[PDB]
Amino acid sequence: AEEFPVPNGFESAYREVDGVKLHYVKGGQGPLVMLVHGFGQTWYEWHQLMPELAKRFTVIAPDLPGLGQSEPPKTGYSGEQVAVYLHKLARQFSPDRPFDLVAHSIGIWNTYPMVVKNQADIARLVYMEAPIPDARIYRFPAFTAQGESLVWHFSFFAADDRLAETLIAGKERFFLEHFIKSHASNTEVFSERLLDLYARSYAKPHSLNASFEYYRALNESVRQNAELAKTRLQMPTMTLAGGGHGGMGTFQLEQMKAYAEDVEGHVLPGCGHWLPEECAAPMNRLVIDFLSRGRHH
Amino acid sequence: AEEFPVPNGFESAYREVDGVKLHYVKGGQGPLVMLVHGFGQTWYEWHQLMPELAKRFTVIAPDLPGLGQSEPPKTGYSGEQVAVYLHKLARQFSPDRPFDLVAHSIGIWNTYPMVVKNQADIARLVYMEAPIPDARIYRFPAFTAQGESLVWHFSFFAADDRLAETLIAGKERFFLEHFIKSHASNTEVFSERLLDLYARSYAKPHSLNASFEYYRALNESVRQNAELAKTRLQMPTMTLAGGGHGGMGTFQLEQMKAYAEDVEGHVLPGCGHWLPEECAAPMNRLVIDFLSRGR
């Protein structure tokens, strides 16, 4: 019983990677593009981009370990540990060619280590809407002159005593609606039905826990990344960020400039955090154009 | 009925102030000292200090509007609005003489405006464990290299859509233990029994809502204080802060220096946010000695 509708011409499937059963949706022909979702979401956030990309690329969108229909990681939730699963999953499908990688939100946290450690395996890199975990995240404000800040949820979710799971259980739909909308410019794109689907998925007890375990591991990821970042990324890279309420703005490119030699960035006015949903048309266009300046049947 | 046990020789009473019934506990004789509690607690946080002070002073410990057994404010929850209720209450018992003030946590927010606006009514002042609302609060981090930060709850509590009440309703006892202990160094003083007392009080629906309204008015209080702070405090002031896990550390005194001409500060080692309970002996000593420099 699929959690989300699969686009025509795509298949929902599973692969075991290091003893962990990962779910993914795959379609298209050509060089591989892997699309990695973030918090509060699943592979489905890419469902609009996928059919367009599948015109020129083989497209795979996995569920992060513990989220959607993927099993929890058997190692842990730090960036380096999760990155191994996504890397080996990608290699099962693109053993002989480098693949492209597109990541959003915590998808960035869970891919950066495998990108920096396997540069030859990565053709092109698109990162949108989330800091690479590093010391910069310690600068975001707890509170603003206009109300709640952008990332006070880092503390909420990282807190022990299962704080987040305990408070949110039974209110998963309620919390996710508030969180999505507080980080959105365009809230209308999030129908009652869309919110129901996302809320139902992450409300699975193991998925609600997984959601926050990514955050409880964030400081470890920061420490891991302090070593990894000694090696600059050398592949062509694009960043995207929303310019509206909820978005990262100029931060995305400014940070990436410290990690990547070859990088370009766009800020999308009128869009918040949830680029694939709030600003599907322009986001899709920028991604496709960026990736299509390489190999693609 | 009483939510918390009154110390021997003290009385629990109520006083109507601008149409709001304030609960307070009072005892002792001599010049008035008013002790104002903060978030997650009630007058009861002062119960160990009160008997000692009552040997030299008349001591009054009110419940903040909406919290403990006090009615919610009729005007609003900004510091300037709430401070009126507290000033008028104090002045009923000390109409012809200045009084002393001790405040903790959001008790600071709710007294600063009455202090700066009525400087002659305040003999001596002790503030502990909370920023005066001003632009400095926008500089605290959402997240730290050790985990959850000191004041991320500002955003949580101020969030729209009654986010905090909705998530916390029915889990008040769970949430309060986590909040208190995460902001403590000496966690062992918060026994299950004491936590039960505090949780039962703030679990009253109007109290849970009041708790968060103070944070929802925080930006307004910052705006209010921007004007009020053009005038420095002239009376003797002392700040205390915890030096341990969950404490404000050197921030307390450094900020107060911008507000007061006459200030001395102490950071108490191995104590977090909840000084009256985590570090009763040294905290009580410091307050009693400081206030006893005045007649």
Q: Is A195 an 8 Å CB contact of chain B?
A: no
- Residue B4 in any domain: the answer is no
The number of angstroms, rounded, from the C-alpha of A249 to the middle of its chain's C-alpha atoms is 17
Residues in CB range of A95: below 8 A, 6 or more apart: none
A147-148 and A143-144 as β-strands: parallel, antiparallel, unpaired?
Answer: antiparallel
Is residue B105, in this structure, part of any structural domain at all?
A: yes
Minimum-distance CB partner of A148 among B155, B168, B171 = B155
Nearest to B166 among A140, A149, A174 (CB): A174
- What's the longest Cα–Cα distance across chain A? 52
Domain, as residue range, for A85: 9-292
Q: How are beta strands B11-17 and B20-28 bridged, if at all?
A: antiparallel
Domain membership of residue A4 (yes or no) is no
Q: What is the spatial distance between Cα B278 and Cα B274, in angstroms, rounded to a whole number? A: 6
Q: How far is B148 from chain A (nearest CA, A)?
A: 4
* Gap from A207 CA to chain B (nearest CA, Å): 19
Query: Which amino acid would we find at residue B33?
Result: V
CB B99 within 8 A of CB B32: yes
Q: Would B1 be classed as within a structural domain?
A: no
- Establish if B174 belongs to a structural domain: yes
**Residues A179-213, buried b or exposed e (16+ Cβ, 10 A)?**
bbbbbbbbbeebeeeebebbbebbbbeebbbbbbb
> Is the residue at A3 inside a domain?
no
Residue type, A130: A
CATH number for A99: 3.40.50.1820
Structure determined via: X-ray
User: Is B108 among the domain residues?
Assistant: yes
CA distance linking residue A156 with residue A182, whole number of Å: 15
SS (H, E, C) chain B: CCCCCCCCCCEEEEEEECCEEEEEEEEECCCEEEEECCCCCCHHHHCCCHHHHCCCCEEEEECCCCCCCCCCCCCCCCHHHHHHHHHHHHHHHCCCCCEEEEEECHHHHCCHHHHHHCHHHEEEEEEECCCCCCHHHHHCECEECCEECCCCHHHHHHCCCCHHHHHHCCCHHHHHHHHHHHCCCCHHHCCHHHHHHHHHHHCCHHHHHHHHHHHHCHHHHHHHHHHHCCCCECCCEEEEEECCCCCCCCHHHHHHHHHECCEEEEEECCCCCCHHHHCHHHHHHHHHHHHCCCC
The rounded distance, in Å, linking the Cα atoms of B245 and B271 is 7
3-state secondary structure of A146: coil
Alpha helix (H) residue ranges in A70-204: 79-93, 106-109, 112-117, 153-158, 163-168, 172-182, 192-203
Q: How many domains does chain B have?
A: 1
> How far apart are alpha carbons B207 and B44 in whole angstroms?
15
User: Phi-psi bin for B221: left (phi > 0), alpha (psi -120 to 50), beta?
Assistant: alpha
Report how far residue B107's alpha carbon sits from residue B86's, in angstroms, rounded to the nearest whole number.
Answer: 10
A166 CB neighbours in chain B (<8 A) are 171, 174
